[PDB]
């Protein structure tokens, strides 16, 4: 996260770290959506142009974390993966369209003060909140600058941007399964997700029921926090039918 700040303890209790077993290192962010299911970006697990193709046994999920590098004894919980599910129409060839994956845990995780699931939006909450200018929140342990790494989880609030502005900021083909967020050059304030924040959640707090909803997944961006560029996020609601199908069939 570029130009963010340290998270408060328990501020994002659905935040998940995807951890590589060997070598031991951060692979991506992710989010907890139930006691057995974790949501992330498909490109965290599968990206052939960079020779990335992780299998279940390659990875661990670390939940309840704050420190990036410490083993947070008595606080974090570490889970093994039962199965990975990648969207069948994930477009790694072109533009990361449908950049979404689910991971089923081998065993349910116990909820605590530091571990708790986020809501997924229904159609109405999505329609109400996914509007240009409305701000969401991104969290992660990724890079602090485009070209270092944070001691603890970082957080930044960012406004959703009008679709034509998103489109005009890039040569990449944008789809309805993506949205973009960030400040414009004229707006002064800044901030962005970055490498390592991939797969983590873009959340919004509903003013109707005071619950946090995951609207986006950190997907892609041209550099990090560049003037005139925006961060792109997987549109969770647009892909919710797939999410529900996977959970209903395999959960």
């Amino acid at each position: 996260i570029v130009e963010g700040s340290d998270a408060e303890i328990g501020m994002s209790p659905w935040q998940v770290m995807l951890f590589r077993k060997s070598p031991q290192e951060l692979l991506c962010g992710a989010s907890l959506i139930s006691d057995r299911w974790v949501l992330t970006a498909a490109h965290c697990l599968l990206y052939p142009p960079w020779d990335k193709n992780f299998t279940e046994n390659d990875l661990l999920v670390r939940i309840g974390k704050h420190s990036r590098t410490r083993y947070e004894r008595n606080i974090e919980k570490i889970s093994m993966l039962e199965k990975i599910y990648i969207h069948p129409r994930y477009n790694w060839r072109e533009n990361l369209d449908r950049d979404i994956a689910l991971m089923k845990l081998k065993k349910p995780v116990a909820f605590s003060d530091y571990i708790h699931p986020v809501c997924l939006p229904d159609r109405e909450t999505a329609a109400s909140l996914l509007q240009a200018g409305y701000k969401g929140r991104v969290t992660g342990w990724g890079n602090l600058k485009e070209t270092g790494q944070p001691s603890v989880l970082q957080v930044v609030n960012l406004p959703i941007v009008e679709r034509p502005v998103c489109k005009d900021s890039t040569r990449i083909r944008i789809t309805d399964n993506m949205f973009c967020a960030g400040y414009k050059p004229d707006e002064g304030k800044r901030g962005d997700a970055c490498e390592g924040d991939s797969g983590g959640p873009f959340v919004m707090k509903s003013p109707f029921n005071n619950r946090w909803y995951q609207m986006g997944i950190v997907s892609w961006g041209e550099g990090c926090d560049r003037d005139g560029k925006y961060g792109f996020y997987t549109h969770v609601f647009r892909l919710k039918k797939w999410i529900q199908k996977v959970i209903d069939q395999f959960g």
Binding site: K21, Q24, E25, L26, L60, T69, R70, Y71, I78, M80
Partner: peptide, 11 residues
């Protein structure tokens, strides 16, 4: 860079 995690999770 990362603190070692309990071996039980790497089994």
């Amino acid at each position: 860079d990362f603190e070692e995690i309990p071996e039980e999770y790497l089994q």
